[PDB]
Design an enzyme around this catalytic site. Sequence first.
Site: not given
Lengths: 99, 99
Positions: B25-27
């Site tokens: 998850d880059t967020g």
Amino acid sequence: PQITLWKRPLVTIKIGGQLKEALLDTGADDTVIEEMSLPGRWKPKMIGGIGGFIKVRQYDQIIIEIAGHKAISTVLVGPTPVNIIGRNLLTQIGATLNF
Amino acid sequence: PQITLWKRPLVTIKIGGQLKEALLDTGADDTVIEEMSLPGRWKPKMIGGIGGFIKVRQYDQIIIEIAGHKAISTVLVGPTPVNIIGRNLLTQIGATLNF
Ligand SMILES: CC(C)(C)NC(=O)[C@@H]1CN(Cc2cccnc2)CCN1C[C@@H](O)C[C@@H](Cc1ccccc1)C(=O)N[C@H]1c2ccccc2C[C@H]1O
Ligand SMILES: [Cl-]
């Protein structure tokens, strides 16, 4: 670009004719923008995050530009703490996670 | 590898010697794993997402393996709905977001 992840991967977007910053978020199924006026028909939805759920307005077939890529997709508008570009739009701009 | 985003970017991880599935998850600023028995000292922390914040256990210097890539980092454990691999570990395995 190839975006490293030492900081939040933020990009410039245009939506409702407004420029905003948004987070490229591979963990997000959907695209959710902070509360704003947007013209058009919408329907209510609830989406779930790590801290619980929020109610959003679902707009279908909305024009949005993401880091210069012109797109058309479903955009949710509601009380998200940050503008989030999720997989529906990451796919449209051809993004991949590489390691 | 290069992971497209048509589907949730799920990979196999190893933590506490146990195999689990998790979301790249880059967020996510941090890494948070569903409640589990993990040895080691920890301290309480709050992390925030959509919907609000959740209280978790912060474990410093934890060995973890992500899709065959070993790393050592901070790992949070708490009542997250899904196992999330965040930027703190994505950077350690050299992941980038490309488009
Ligand atoms: C569509 C929507 C946006 C609602 N998706 C999510 O919230 C999903 C939810 N699932 C779960 C789910 C829940 C229900 C249904 N399907 C899936 C877990 C993973 N998130 C994706 C996250 O990437 C979203 C970000 C948003 C954010 C970024 C910065 C600041 C505030 C909010 C997120 O929650 N990140 C936070 C985060 C996350 C993990 C560890 C630490 C931290 C801090 C912070 O970076
Ligand atoms: Cl407004």
